[PDB]
Design a protein around this nucleic acid. Structure first.
Ligand SMILES: [Zn+2]
Length: 1369
DNA sequence: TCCTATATAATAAAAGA
């Protein structure tokens, strides 16, 4: 009403003294000098006379001239025609002959390979194109109504350009060059060709509106590995021929950093030439951002850059691509190589340093790239956002705001000739002034109560309108716990027209409807559903009960208004707040979050880079109707985003910054040193102090610091130059976090516990000292303080095993408990029960109770084997230590040679050919990249080659080092190890990832000697992991050739499901795969598609077709629709058919192989319960104890134990496990991969007792050994959850039914697929069908729904969706 | 919206109330 007045910017009256520049009053900085317009007084024009803009072009740009309308419509084409330089593009040529240059979207482009390099080697060039987006007018353009600039206009501009432009004499215009290319083509008879670009639209857009001419009309499409804009692009200059000298070359190449590129590329914007602003005239030398900043500003004198219609959009989008690429490359080029080594190691090396010895010291570290989109930067932002939630608790309010193009402030400023779409600068500046005002109201004015913490991220839509998502964590006093509070903040109904007319109009247009969420929300094909026909229903109450985990607000039926000749009721009014909507006239949606799980989904807004789209380029021939089509997946940048990034405007803001503290052993710190300056490091080392060491000094000299614990010191002090100083500026609170340390180093784990609970430590000695008595080790000190976990559960588990009387298993149980579970005192258990553990060894070696030596040693050695695989040693656990024995893997050379000869004879013809190529490469002495990828359907053929190759190489005396991506795959291969263990790659795997293996370590020597390295499942391996293997191999060898010139055999099948990513769309997922990595070019493909099926050869052929998406028989009914063979479909209950009518303890072994597969985990849990009920037996309930590892005692209050019990994150055991004798169970942890236990290893329960479960292995090498599985501590694999849940439960899950993606490696004799809803991934259906060898053994049941079931109404046949991404295969 | 392989340790740079 009168009280609420719309926010007014106040006009552009204010101007800076240093330079004339019209700026809004709010934008003025505190100092009084505007940074963007002139960098204070630092930026000034050079003293060169500035020519006036030519009159004829100015009259055309304004509407005054008669032919002005035509000029504005064709500005993109006219500018390109008179330009002196061109951009290269790669397009396939029909008939093998193409014109030298072709026109795409109104800009001249030249085929890659038009200029052949004098060196004779052609650099790879990334592809960047400018796309018009609104090519709906192509049909009118094709029609000869005008669409030629009227001819007279072209002649008049051409005459003006020659008279006023000096460059014309030196360089020919593109329009003349294009004619010459056509003339050469005409003589050869090469046909004229037309090139067109199309975008497959994404499902995210404003409802019913996309690609609006008003929202955007120009964009850059670019493809690069990490989404960074490409530095290397091809620009070719055509030079007018000189009669005097034939030496001059017509084609020369200029890089993105050529000095006068701007004047050459865009002639209309700078007509006079390389004079005035076209030449370098910025003074006091000026960075690229500063130059663009000066030009894109509004001043009284006419500015060509902001008043040129479509060209203005192209200039801004092209300039952002050039500026970002130049900054990223310059920073990377000017980077010193850095190496990190511990202080103890460097000092030891220096004392024993060999004179004149060149040895690399330490591990290489690669510093992060500047671009925000790069993976490492994004991961840090997510971790920082997560800790604000952990400390301040669950978020209370989520608010989203979107720009309105018809806002009064944007319209009044625009001059009559300009249109909102043509000028991007005003939209970005007005939005920033408004967002800052709303942000201030919420926090500075305490709107919606006191706000403690805030996170805000701005993302641009395909239309290009900017929208910002804000999350607010309120203080405890104002937290919303009542229906009365929820109603005042959020309202979901149409306002009374008489009571509040202005509000009624704002709600009527901005928030009238929400797109119905039925497969496609934006598409208006569901016209009825699009407006007022959506999920919300008349609840009639605030009901903040989290029924579905989302509160449902009050909606009352019976109120409706007329919009677009339609009636929309209270069913669909997006939740809106009155004061905010009245003040800023734009769509503001306020929603309340009442579940911590709701944030888990919402936090993913901060994980994106640029918008992702799919573009297909087609070349067509007029003479004959021949078209060639190619598919490119590339990032998209709109014009409004580019102006936002070019100016210094923030895209992410967090209220509290985070400082990371360090936990280090007493003599080991971290020093980072440049490789060349080794001598300086020795002097610098004494001075360097890490955060922990500094804390000791602050305690020694300051009384006040004693009160705070080590974790809280960052909040009250700041670190500069290796010292801590008090902070008196009232600066942004910094939270402070301590990292988590793993049990692999026991002392460091004990140190973390002491720092968390001990305060006022003068020096390391004080931390160990407790109650006036020093203790020799950190572990002893912790026990006396009493901050250690109880070991009662472990003692009981060991006692039960002794009663069982099976000795070998008891020794294994001790190893599994110590490595995975954390035992405070392992030594005590071993000493008390030593006789029971070593009883078997005593009986065989020394008859009955004989007295001899090494009986204990033999027992300890068996336990040590499990420790070696995980990397721990017996000394760490304080067990008695005996020196390790030595054995040789190669064994008999004669035996390996004889076995190899027989295997070679049985190989198939395609297989034999592969053996010959791999053997030849090992013999060849030339230094050339030697990487081979073995393709072909996943199956028996690939494994047999690995066996024959290993035998042949061992026979010649060389060594092979087999490794595999998954634990189950590793068990099959001899001596299998997970590739993440062999090369010790970091678990997050960001772009800057380096292997932790030491160059001089014994393991490194083994990799150097090995002739061949084999990876069983490349499909699972991500691009980052393959890159890290390349760096380590290059470092160990002296060569710089890819992969150290070592033969590699990364066999894999790409039809199977790709590696899961936390959030991505089709365009995002394809780029991270091995195919889009740079090293892929060197790889040479060997094909092994010969099919090896014991029976039902027809079934194998059908599987390949489903995987390749070649089945198009029913595609006519719908896209991606296939028909299952009739015999397989089963109306009857899938449980009865797949597992058999009879399920009993007596016959469980016969039906053990069979299993049921379902797409979503929820359905799987329901099926498992029913089968368990039918089985005879008595239910035993094993409960679990769950805790959150935390740096703060209060953090536990925010997430209560009752909440932790309910959550069951993927890859973790259930809180309440119900199991009965004869059930099938699957291990969820690798444990001992070599012996047989793995990520699968399904077992049949034999006996169940408290604290111990006895099972028999149904799959893998063990095949029937009896293993006892103890409780172990399991932690969530994903980092999405804010807290780290440590839950101890038997690592087991009921396994009668498994999700399709958990069954990639298992082989099942009979399988039944139950599909409640259609599949949603890369290889989902293919994996489910592939498990069974023959067609008769698959039974499928489909539930009828909108997209699946009997799609033809009169046809009794069932159709299901098959999803395959064509680009990956 | 969903699905979840591996399973240990986490960067050099100035400046404000
Ligand atoms: Zn200025």
């Amino acid at each position: 009403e009168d009280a609420i007045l719309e926010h007014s910017c106040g006009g552009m009256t204010v101007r800076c003294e240093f330079c004339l520049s019209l700026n809004f009053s709010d934008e003025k900085p505190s100092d009084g000098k505007f940074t963007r317009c002139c960098s204070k007084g630092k930026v000034c024009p050079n003293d060169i006379h500035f020519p006036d803009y030519p009159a004829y072009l100015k009259r055309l740009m304004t509407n005054e001239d008669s032919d002005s309308k035509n000029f504005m419509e064709n500005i993109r084409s006219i500018n390109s025609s008179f330009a002196f330089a061109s951009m290269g593009a790669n397009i396939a040529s029909p008939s093998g002959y193409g014109p030298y240059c072709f026109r795409i979207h109104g800009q001249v482009y030249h085929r890659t390979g038009t200029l052949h390099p004098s060196d004779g080697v052609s650099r790879k060039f990334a592809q960047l194109y400018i796309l018009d987006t609104a090519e709906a007018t192509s049909k009118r353009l094709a029609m000869p109504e005008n669409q030629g600039c009227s001819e007279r206009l072209m002649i008049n501009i051409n005459n003006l350009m020659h008279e006023i432009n000096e460059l014309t004499k030196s360089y020919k215009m593109l329009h003349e060059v294009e004619k010459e290319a056509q003339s050469e083509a005409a003589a050869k008879g090469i046909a004229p060709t037309e090139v067109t670009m199309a975008i497959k639209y994404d499902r995210n857009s404003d409802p019913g509106r996309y690609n609006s001419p008003r929202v955007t009309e120009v964009a850059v499409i670019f493809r690069n590995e990490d989404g960074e804009p490409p530095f290397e692009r091809d620009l070719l200059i055509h030079c007018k021929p000189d009669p005097n000298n034939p030496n001059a070359t017509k084609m020369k190449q200029i890089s993105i950093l050529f000095p006068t590129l701007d004047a050459m590329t865009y002639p209309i914007l700078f007509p006079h030439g390389e004079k005035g602003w076209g030449t370098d005239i910025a003074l006091r030398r000026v960075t690229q951002m500063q130059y663009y900043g000066f030009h894109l500003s509004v001043r009284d004198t006419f500015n060509p850059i902001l008043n040129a219609g479509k060209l203005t959009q192209q200039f801004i989008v092209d300039s952002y691509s050039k500026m970002e690429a130049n900054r990223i490359n310059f920073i990377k080029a000017n980077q010193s190589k850095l190496r990190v080594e511990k202080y103890s190691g460097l000092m030891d090396y220096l004392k024993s340093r060999s004179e004149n010895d060149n040895v690399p010291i330490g591990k290489m570290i690669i510093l992060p790239s500047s671009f925000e989109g790069s993976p490492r930067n994004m991961q840090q932002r997510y971790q920082d956002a997560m800790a604000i939630v952990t400390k301040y608790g669950k978020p209370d309010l989520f608010i989203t705001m979107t720009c309105n193009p018809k806002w009064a402030d944007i319209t009044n400023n625009l001059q009559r000739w300009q249109k909102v779409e043509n000028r991007p600068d005003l939209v970005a500046r007005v939005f920033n002034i408004k967002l800052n005002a709303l942000l201030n109201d919420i926090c500075k004015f305490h709107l919606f109560g006191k706000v403690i913490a805030k996170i805000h991220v701005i993302e641009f839509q395909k239309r290009g309108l900017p929208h910002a998502h804000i999350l607010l964590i309120l203080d405890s006093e104002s937290k919303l716990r009542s229906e009365d509070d929820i109603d005042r903040i959020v309202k979901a109904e149409i306002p009374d027209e008489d009571q509040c007319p202005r509000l009624f109009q704002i709600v009527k247009s901005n928030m009238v409807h929400g797109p119905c969420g039925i497969q496609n929300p934006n598409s208006p094909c569901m016209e009825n559903g699009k407006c007022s026909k959506g999920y919300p229903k008349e609840f009639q109450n605030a009901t903040i009960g989290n029924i579905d985990g989302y509160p449902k607000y009050k909606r009352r039926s019976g109120s409706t208004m007329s919009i677009g000749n339609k009636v929309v009721d209270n069913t669909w009014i997006v939740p809106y707040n009155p004061y905010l909507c009245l003040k800023y006239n734009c769509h503001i949606n306020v929603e309340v979050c009442a579940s911590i799980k709701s944030v888990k989904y919402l936090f993913k807004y901060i994980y994106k880079g640029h918008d992702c789209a799919n573009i297909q380029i087609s070349e067509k021939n007029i003479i004959n109707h021949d078209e060639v089509q190619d598919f490119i997946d590339s990032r998209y940048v709109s014009a409004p985003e580019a102006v936002w990034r070019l100016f210094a405007m923030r895209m992410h803001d967090q209220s509290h910054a985070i400082t990371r503290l360090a936990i280090h052993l007493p003599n080991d710190q971290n020093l980072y040193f440049h490789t060349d300056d080794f001598a300086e490091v020795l002097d610098r080392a004494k001075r360097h102090n890490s955060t922990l060491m500094a804390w000791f000094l602050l305690n020694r000299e300051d009384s006040d610091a004693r009160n705070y614990y080590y974790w809280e010191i960052p909040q009250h002090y700041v670190f500069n130059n290796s010292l801590w100083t008090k902070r008196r500026k009232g600066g942004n609170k910094v939270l402070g976090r301590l990292f988590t340390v793993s049990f692999r180093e026991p002392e460091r784990y004990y140190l973390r516990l002491l720092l968390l609970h001990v305060k006022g430590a003068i020096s390391f000695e004080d931390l160990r000292t407790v109650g006036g008595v020093t203790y020799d080790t950190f572990h002893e000190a912790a026990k006396h303080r009493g901050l250690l976990l109880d070991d009662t559960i472990w003692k009981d588990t060991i006692d039960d095993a002794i009663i069982l009387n099976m000795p070998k298993q008891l020794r294994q149980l001790f190893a599994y408990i110590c490595v995975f579970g954390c035992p405070s005192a392992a030594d005590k258990l071993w000493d008390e029960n030593k006789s029971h553990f070593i009883e078997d060894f005593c009986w065989k070696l020394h008859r009955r109770e004989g007295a001899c030596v090494n009986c204990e040693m033999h027992a300890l050695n068996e336990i040590q084997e499990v420790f070696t695989l995980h990397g721990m040693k017996c000394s760490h656990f304080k067990l008695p230590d005996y020196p390790l024995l030595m054995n040789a893997n190669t064994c008999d050379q004669l035996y390996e040679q004889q076995q190899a000869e027989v295997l070679i004879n049985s190989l198939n013809d395609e297989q034999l050919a592969a053996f010959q190529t791999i053997t030849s490469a090992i013999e060849d002495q030339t230094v050339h990249p030697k990487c081979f990828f073995l393709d072909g359907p996943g199956g028996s053929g690939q494994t047999y080659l690995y066996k024959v190759l290993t035998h042949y190489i061992r026979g010649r005396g060389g060594t092979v080092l087999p490794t595999a991506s998954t634990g189950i795959a590793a068990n099959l291969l001899l001596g299998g190890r997970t590739f993440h263990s062999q090369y010790k790659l970091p678990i997050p795997l960001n772009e800057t990832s380096i292997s932790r293996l030491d160059i001089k370590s014994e393991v490194a020597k083994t990799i150097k000697k090995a002739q061949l390295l084999i990876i069983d499942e490349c499909t699972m391996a991500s691009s980052h992991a393959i890159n890290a293997i390349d760096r380590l191999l290059r470092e160990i060898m002296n060569l710089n050739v890819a992969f150290g010139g070592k033969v590699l055999l990364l066999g894999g099948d790409f039809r199977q499901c790709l590696s899961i990513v936390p959030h991505a769309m089709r365009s995002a997922i394809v780029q991270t795969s091995l195919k889009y990595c740079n090293v892929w070019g060197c790889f040479r493909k060997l094909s092994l598609k010969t099919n090896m099926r014991s029976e039902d050869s027809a079934y194998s052929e059908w599987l390949v077709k489903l995987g390749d998406g070649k089945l198009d028989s029913s595609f006519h009914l719908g896209m991606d629709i296939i028909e299952i063979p009739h015999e397989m479909i089963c109306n009857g209950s899938i449980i009865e058919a797949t597992f058999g009518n009879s399920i009993s303890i007596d016959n469980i072994k016969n039906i053990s192989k069979r299993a049921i597969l379902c797409p979503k985990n929820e359905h799987v849990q329901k099926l498992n319960e029913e089968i368990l009920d039918i089985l005879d037996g008595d239910f035993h309930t094993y409960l679990s104890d769950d805790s959150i590892d935390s740096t703060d005692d209060a953090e536990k209050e925010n997430f209560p134990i009752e909440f932790l019990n309910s959550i069951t994150p993927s890859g973790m055991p259930c809180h309440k496990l119900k199991l009965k004798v004869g059930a099938i169970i699957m291990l969820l942890r690798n444990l001992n991969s070599k012996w047989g236990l793995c990520n699968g290893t399904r077992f049949i329960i034999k006996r169940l007792r408290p604290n111990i479960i006895e099972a028999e292995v149904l799959t893998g090498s063990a095949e029937g050994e009896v293993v006892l599985i103890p409780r172990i501590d399991l932690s969530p694999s994903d980092t999405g959850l804010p807290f780290k849940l440590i839950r101890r439960q038997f690592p087991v899950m009921p396994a009668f039914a498994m999700t399709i993606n958990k069954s990639q490696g298992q082989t099942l004799d009979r399988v039944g697929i139950f599909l409640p809803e259609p599949v949603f991934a890369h290889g989902q259906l293919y994996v489910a069908f592939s498990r069974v060898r023959r067609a008769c053994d698959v039974k499928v049941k489909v539930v009828n729904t909108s997209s699946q079931g009997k799609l033809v109404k009169h046809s009794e046949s069932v159709f299901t969706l098959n999803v395959v991404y064509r680009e990956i295969l």
